[PDB]
Design a protein around this ligand. Structure first.
Ligand SMILES: [Ca+2]
Lengths: 444, 158
């Protein structure tokens, strides 16, 4: 490797630093701002394709002279200021308009685009002071908790950032050790310790302080630093919608935002250093149907944007548990309350109807331990209410049938009996179909 | 209660290209099975015993009354011991056995209803045949389920 850095004026024409790019204008980013690296005393900036060139402090330095051939505006500037930074800013919206799309290309050179005369320009060196490219990787080892009344989920996992910062490089001999490691201190804390920029991140939804374990940020003399942290963090989940519990599919969205704008650092590439979702022994409450990691942009607290890395896990409950524990005994109690209409003794039927309604209440509260004490209704709660209403109704019908048997009308009692036999299963089937249509379909 | 313990030293890929030394202490622990057998399974077996012996008196009205009462008792006992049942999101062999026991008690309630109907309609020989058939199948149903759960959750060789 060849080393670059700082220690303790001929043939400048071949080392021409001139390179170009194409841009897209839409939505909020109508105004575009670009920086540049430090320049030699003799370097003169030529801008070609309004636009204006200032310094890092915003003090205006040059405007553009409009030359009709080649369209657009031509700008040129020169200075002898030694250590300084320059900025070029272009505004594409000088008046209110519908717009919606704009294609634009620029010509940029730090000494002489005239010598290069645009073209392919292979030897050109980018001089926009491009944002550092930080790769990110995240793995989930467990979903330790899900508080569904408060709508949060506590998840444990590993996070690994990796970015190349040449300014962070150092001589290996001065400290002996090859890798310079800062233990159990956040990226922000390290950036405070050594006055350098670092890609400080956050989880954007955590409530309380996450438990950071084994977290270490270590730098290699070449400059490729990397940060590792095994977190136990309680994220907030507004997207939770338990209206279809227990048949619901939920999105566990773990969003790592960068606390620095897109100008400084951006999440370059997602790193699959470890299985995104871990496989652990046991059925587990939430089984992961699918996962997806992807990088987006989010409007940062300033006028710029920050890079966000979201890991979305599609999780679902172990539906066998609810079907076999909640719905099978429920169907059996309903079957008892429906079959009490066969013996038609009208006193024994009433006794068993009352006893079965009591059984239904007792079973309801027996399984009430897993029923979430949410403030709103749920398809499981709705079905429980329908079942209780129908059992109370069959108690009432048994009372009326006993009255009819005692008054001397038994044919009418038998007609009501067989009518209950025929309507009860279709009432339950109709309600199940209605709830399925309401809570699980839109097309049909 | 700790069945066995074992301390040993391994190597683990460290955060760098090297490895770190790890010292793992593994304790093989198990629950006090006497507590679950004597508190959860013995009263349960007694409840199934009641629901199986109600098929002897064959009064078909008293049998139905005791069947409904015993199903209510089973629900109440299930929730009495629900304090120690872990509210895990997935099923368990204890939960599976409770589920099967409840389904069988509800089924004997249904069979008692059908037997009462048969006694009232004038067919008592068929009622007695169903009664003795329940007597012979119920213990073998429970034994078959226990053997099946043992094979599924405790063996691979057999
Ligand atoms: Ca597990």
């Amino acid at each position: 490797t060849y080393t670059t850095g700082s220690f303790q004026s001929l043939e400048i024409k071949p080392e021409a630093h001139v390179q170009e790019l194409e841009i897209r204008l839409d939505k909020d980013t109508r105004y575009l701002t670009q920086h540049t690296r430090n320049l030699q005393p003799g370097d003169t900036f030529h801008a070609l394709v309004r636009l204006r060139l200032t310094d890092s402090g915003g003090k205006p330095l040059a405007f553009g002279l409009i030359d009709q051939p080649g369209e657009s505006v031509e700008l040129n500037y020169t200075c002898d200021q030694d250590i300084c930074e320059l900025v070029v800013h272009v505004d594409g919206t000088d008046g209110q308009k519908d717009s919606g799309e704009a294609v634009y290309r620029l010509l940029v050179g730090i000494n002489a685009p005239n010598l290069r005369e645009s073209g392919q320009t292979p030897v050109g060196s980018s001089v926009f002071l491009e944002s550092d490219l930080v790769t990110v990787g995240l793995a989930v080892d467990q979903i330790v908790g899900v508080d569904q009344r408060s709508e949060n989920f506590s998840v444990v996992g590993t996070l690994k950032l990796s970015w190349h910062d040449p300014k962070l490089g150092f001589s290996p001999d001065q400290c002996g050790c090859t890798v310079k490691s800062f233990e159990d201190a956040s990226i922000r804390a390290v950036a405070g310790e050594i006055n350098l920029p670092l890609p400080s991140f956050s989880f954007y939804n955590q409530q309380g302080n996450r438990w950071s374990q084994n977290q270490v940020i270590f730098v290699t003399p070449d400059g490729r630093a990397s940060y590792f942290e095994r977190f136990t963090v309680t994220l907030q989940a507004p997207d939770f919608d338990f209206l279809a519990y227990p048949f619901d599919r939920q999105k566990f969205s773990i969003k790592v935002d960068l606390a620095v704008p897109t100008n400084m650092f951006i999440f370059n590439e997602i790193e699959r250093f470890q299985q995104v979702v871990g496989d652990q022994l046991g059925e587990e409450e939430w089984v992961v149907t699918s996962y997806s990691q992807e990088i987006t942009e989010v409007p940062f607290e300033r006028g710029s944007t920050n890079s966000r890395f979201t890991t979305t896990l599609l999780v679902k409950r172990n539906l066998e548990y609810y079907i076999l524990r909640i719905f099978v005994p429920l169907f059996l109690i309903i079957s008892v309350s429906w079959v009490i209409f066969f013996l038609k003794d009208y006193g024994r039927q009433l006794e068993v109807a009352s006893g079965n309604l009591l059984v239904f209440v007792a079973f309801n509260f027996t399984i009430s331990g897993d029923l979430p004490r949410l403030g709103y209704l749920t398809v499981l709660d709705r079905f429980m209410i329908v079942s209780f209403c129908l059992t109370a109704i069959v108690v009432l019908i048994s009372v009326c049938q006993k009255r009819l048997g005692a008054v001397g009308k038994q044919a009418v009692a038998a007609q009501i009996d067989t009518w209950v036999l025929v309507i009860y299963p279709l009432v339950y089937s109709l309600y199940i179909i209605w709830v399925y249509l309401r809570f699980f379909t839109d097309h049909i």
